[PDB]
Amino acid sequence: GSELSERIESFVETLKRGGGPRSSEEMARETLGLLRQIITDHRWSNAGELMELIRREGRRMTAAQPSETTVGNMVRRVLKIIREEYGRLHGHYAQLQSNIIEAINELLVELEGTMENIAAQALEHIHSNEVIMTIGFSRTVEAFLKEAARKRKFHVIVAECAPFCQGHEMAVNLSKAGIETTVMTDAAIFAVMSRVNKVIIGTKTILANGALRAVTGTHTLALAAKHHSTPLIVCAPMFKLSPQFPNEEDSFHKFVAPEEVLPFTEGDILEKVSVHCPVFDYVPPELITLFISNIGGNAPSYIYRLMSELYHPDDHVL
Amino acid sequence: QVPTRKDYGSKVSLFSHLPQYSRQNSLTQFMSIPSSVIHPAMVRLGLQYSQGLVSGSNARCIALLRALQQVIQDYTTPPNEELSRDLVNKLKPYMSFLTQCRPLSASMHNAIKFLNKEITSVGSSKREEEAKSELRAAIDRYVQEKIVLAAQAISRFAYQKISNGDVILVYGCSSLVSRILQEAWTEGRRFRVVVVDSRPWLEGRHTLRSLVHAGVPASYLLIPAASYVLPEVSKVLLGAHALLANGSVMSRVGTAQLALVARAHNVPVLVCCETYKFCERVQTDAFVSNELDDPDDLQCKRGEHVALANWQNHASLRLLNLVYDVTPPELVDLVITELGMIPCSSVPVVLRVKSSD
Amino acid sequence: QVPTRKDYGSKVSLFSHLPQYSRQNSLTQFMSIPSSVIHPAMVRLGLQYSQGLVSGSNARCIALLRALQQVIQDYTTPPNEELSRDLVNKLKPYMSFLTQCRPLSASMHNAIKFLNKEITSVGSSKREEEAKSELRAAIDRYVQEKIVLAAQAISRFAYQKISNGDVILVYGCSSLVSRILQEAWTEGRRFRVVVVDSRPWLEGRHTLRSLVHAGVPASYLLIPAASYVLPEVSKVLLGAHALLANGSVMSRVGTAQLALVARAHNVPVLVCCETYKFCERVQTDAFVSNELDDPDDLQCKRGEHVALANWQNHASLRLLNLVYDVTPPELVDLVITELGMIPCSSVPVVLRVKSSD
């Protein structure tokens, strides 16, 4: 009853104010648990009313934070699960609900295996004495690299992300496992690119065009890789896949307080200058060489088929 | 004798041939206070360089020329010796001390080469004092023209290129670019300048303050977000630290990246430079010849958790901040000099013309 | 138990994860003559592979299927056991022996996967002999269609693409490309084929002999001179050894170079392949996954002075001949399969359709 309502609220405000939970895998787990509790703790008999209330609460979620697309695309996954179950039972009400629940359960148990799947897949993409470059921080990519490091020796060049220098803690984490790690400013990306073999980077969201929304500055790294023709690898699980297209959407970049870019102590100039701090940026699919997912490697030119396999095309608007 | 500076930190393997120094551990702590091996002005300038108080290329060259004036002014020829060879021989330890405090820039190298050429050109029969002040006047004339007249000419040439209501993107601190923009705004042009900056030096705040003091509308963002702002930018203006024989632009580390992204965004790239910064040297990458600053500058003060605090305690962790990078000549469109507008293809031709050929 | 083959020679550091074997030092010299651990047919096939007597991808796959037929034919189920699991468990040592004699090709991997899938699909209630010959008939049908019918279909699809009086460039030995050209010439097309070959295998002489026997006008040159002949070439036809999920073409080492130079010369590149050689695997370079042949093959017999004779006696000298390379999907235009003409972008789609999906 009101527990469900206040938990939905709590989650909405946690998504709105700050980043909670930090890992987007934990965010997917939390939103899936909440969707399960909603579909269990409501008086819905027909699948249509359930889908409608799910779409409404998902609209509220998406309005809470548009840049966090995992919640929305997993809501769409739940909607596709409901559609599949209704087609199975109609192409049956209690069995409907329990079958939806076991579908969500299998989705959740395969959710925690994507990390291990990518880690296992990592070995056949790294050779000895290779030079990797990565930008920012990504749990999936550091797991990739520290799993490849157990049987291979290679160098990782971590380009810090300004202003949020998450790349520093990533470099430290990689050095923990003895992965020879060079830390540099993002300004030195093109200068060092000539000596890099591969580029491995995570992402925040993959669009239907194949493009991906990743931390700012990664588009420049992709342009450098394309200039030097080095393969650019994206190790992104299959819950960051978003059916929306690049310019049919709104609110792509996430702008945070310019205090991160230019501090308050600069004084009077802060009334004359316009400071901008875009967290995310757009990378076209032409600059991506290969996508690594929990199922296996795929070219950017197959992400649309993955969409068709994951999301109903009438639910791309929620 | 001046001792060698200990190379602080763990160098990246590819840059093992370059020296890496620490700002804290200076070089004058093993020298006599009333310095005799090194001229007082020269040790003063070396200490100023090492601490980073003199940063700009033009600033470094001008400080070098003033210290050299102070040196030659106080120089006295020993008996049974001629000034021509003795002075150029005595200037070498000072240059070595400088390059140990901080690697010499292209402007400094060219200035020292010209000064040695002039000293060797001093007449054997000439007396001492008028030779000394002739050297002083030659240095005054050289710096005067090659700095201020070059700046005025380049400012006029760039003003006849900047149009009304156009967005110009600048990177880092450069006296020439700031002067160009200030003169263009004063002359009557109405534009806005986007300032791009990069860690850890954050030298873009300098040109930002200059533009705001000049009244030019300005915007600020760090180099990773350059891809987001280039759609608005109408033109990229940069300040070169060195222009090599092949036309490549040797300048701050973030210059080639910006040129690449601008080319990707169909934004013409302009670089402003003087003829005295042209160098017959040539390189194809930022690895053969570069400068490694103190790696401790990479550490970010993110409140309560500095992640790279004890980076040396991690065996497999390497830190590196490159001070220079090279832009291939095909990523740059214009080079604005005293002679006017030229393609990067024509840099060695200008070098020849300035070789009195 | 089969012992491990000693890795001959000094491997290149980047390929330290791959095995390097010598043709002289075989693997059957530590095995019982009336082989019992390994089936006689399987050790026969492994010895044939190691010596290089079976080279082509289609040839290797067909020999593998025939050896597997001979194995299952002589297989007998032990008491209190079912064939489904016992046979697939007993086939693994044979596959390991093969991959030790020479790394498995994509066709071989797909064939073994399909055979294991069929074996696991054999009914528990079914008896032994009819199950065995059902497996034999399934292997016969599989090889029959996927080889000969695929070849005929691809030959027809390529014939409706080759025009009259056009120069076609081929590389190395490929049964599919040779058959395509022979059928096109027989049907009525009048063209000439340029054969490109590379050291040390010199497998281009095979297709050269085939073309000359078929009467097709032919020309021959080694791969370094390909840039000289491409102005005349009207089209590049190649034979893929593997087509990965991303559309890249994993084939002989000189294929990607030829595709690059042809793209530079505005020559469309065609690759002929069957669906059974499609692999869900994917790679971006010739380093992650490749095969290192015997480095002693690089030695050239230039009369009286073989330069690389004692290359192992030189400490800092490394020899390497890569057997495979990958062409990015953007350097290739067509892929001709049973389904018809497709772009390399559509390879994973065909994979899905052939996954009974």
UniProtKB/Swiss-Prot annotation, chain A:
Keyword set, alphabetical order: Cytoplasm, Disease variant, Initiation factor, Leukodystrophy, Protein biosynthesis
Q: Do you know which Gene3D superfamilies this protein is assigned to?
A: Translation initiation factor eif-2b, domain 2
A GO BP annotation: central nervous system development
Outcome reported for the amino acid change (mutating S138F): In VWM2; with ovarian failure
Modes of activity regulation: Activated by the chemical integrated stress response (ISR) inhibitor ISRIB which stimulates guanine nucleotide exchange factor activity for both phosphorylated and unphosphorylated eIF2.
Please provide, alphabetically and separated by semicolons, the GO molecular function terms listed in this UniProt record: ATP binding; GTP binding; guanyl-nucleotide exchange factor activity; translation initiation factor activity
UniProt-reported outcome of changing E180G: In VWM2; with and without ovarian failure
Q: Which disease is it linked to?
A: Leukoencephalopathy with vanishing white matter 2: An autosomal recessive brain disease characterized by neurological features including progressive cerebellar ataxia, spasticity, and cognitive deficits. Brain imaging shows abnormal white matter that vanishes over time and is replaced by cerebrospinal fluid. Disease severity ranges from fatal infantile forms to adult forms without neurological deterioration. The disease is progressive with, in most individuals, additional episodes of rapid deterioration following febrile infections or minor head trauma.
* Subunit-structure text: Component of the translation initiation factor 2B (eIF2B) complex which is a heterodecamer of two sets of five different subunits: alpha, beta, gamma, delta and epsilon. Subunits alpha, beta and delta comprise a regulatory subcomplex and subunits epsilon and gamma comprise a catalytic subcomplex. Within the complex, the hexameric regulatory complex resides at the center, with the two heterodimeric catalytic subcomplexes bound on opposite sides.
According to its UniProt entry, the function of this protein is described as: Acts as a component of the translation initiation factor 2B (eIF2B) complex, which catalyzes the exchange of GDP for GTP on eukaryotic initiation factor 2 (eIF2) gamma subunit. Its guanine nucleotide exchange factor activity is repressed when bound to eIF2 complex phosphorylated on the alpha subunit, thereby limiting the amount of methionyl-initiator methionine tRNA available to the ribosome and consequently global translation is repressed.
Would you identify the family this protein belongs to, as annotated?
Answer: Belongs to the eIF-2B alpha/beta/delta subunits family.
Q: What is this protein called?
A: Translation initiation factor eIF2B subunit beta
Q: Which organism is it from?
A: Homo sapiens
Tell me the organism's taxonomic lineage. Eukaryota, Metazoa, Chordata, Craniata, Vertebrata
Swiss-Prot record, chains B, C:
| GO cellular component terms given for this protein | cytoplasm; cytosol; eukaryotic translation initiation factor 2B complex
Q: How is its activity regulated?
A: Activated by the chemical integrated stress response (ISR) inhibitor ISRIB which stimulates guanine nucleotide exchange factor activity for both phosphorylated and unphosphorylated eIF2.
What is a GO molecular function of this protein?
guanyl-nucleotide exchange factor activity
From the Swiss-Prot or TrEMBL record, state where the protein is found.
Cytoplasm, Cytosol
**Region (May bind the chemical integrated stress response (ISR) inhibitor ISRIB), start-end ranges:** 5-14
Coarse class of the protein's main subcellular location: cytoplasm
**Which keywords describe this protein according to UniProt?**
Acetylation, Cytoplasm, Disease variant, Initiation factor, Leukodystrophy, Phosphoprotein, Protein biosynthesis
Biological process, per Gene Ontology:
cytoplasmic translational initiation; myelination; oligodendrocyte development; ovarian follicle development; regulation of translation; response to glucose; response to heat; response to peptide hormone
Q: Which residues form a coiled coil?
A: none
State the protein's purpose.
Acts as a component of the translation initiation factor 2B (eIF2B) complex, which catalyzes the exchange of GDP for GTP on eukaryotic initiation factor 2 (eIF2) gamma subunit. Its guanine nucleotide exchange factor activity is repressed when bound to eIF2 complex phosphorylated on the alpha subunit, thereby limiting the amount of methionyl-initiator methionine tRNA available to the ribosome and consequently global translation is repressed.
What's this protein's family per the entry? Belongs to the eIF-2B alpha/beta/delta subunits family.
The record's subunit annotation is:
Component of the translation initiation factor 2B (eIF2B) complex which is a heterodecamer of two sets of five different subunits: alpha, beta, gamma, delta and epsilon. Subunits alpha, beta and delta comprise a regulatory subcomplex and subunits epsilon and gamma comprise a catalytic subcomplex. Within the complex, the hexameric regulatory complex resides at the center, with the two heterodimeric catalytic subcomplexes bound on opposite sides.
Disease the record associates with this protein: Leukoencephalopathy with vanishing white matter 4: An autosomal recessive brain disease characterized by neurological features including progressive cerebellar ataxia, spasticity, and cognitive deficits. Brain imaging shows abnormal white matter that vanishes over time and is replaced by cerebrospinal fluid. Disease severity ranges from fatal infantile forms to adult forms without neurological deterioration. The disease is progressive with, in most individuals, additional episodes of rapid deterioration following febrile infections or minor head trauma.
Q: What is this protein called?
A: Translation initiation factor eIF2B subunit delta
- Organism of derivation: Homo sapiens (Human)
Q: What is the lineage of its organism?
A: Eukaryota, Metazoa, Chordata, Craniata, Vertebrata
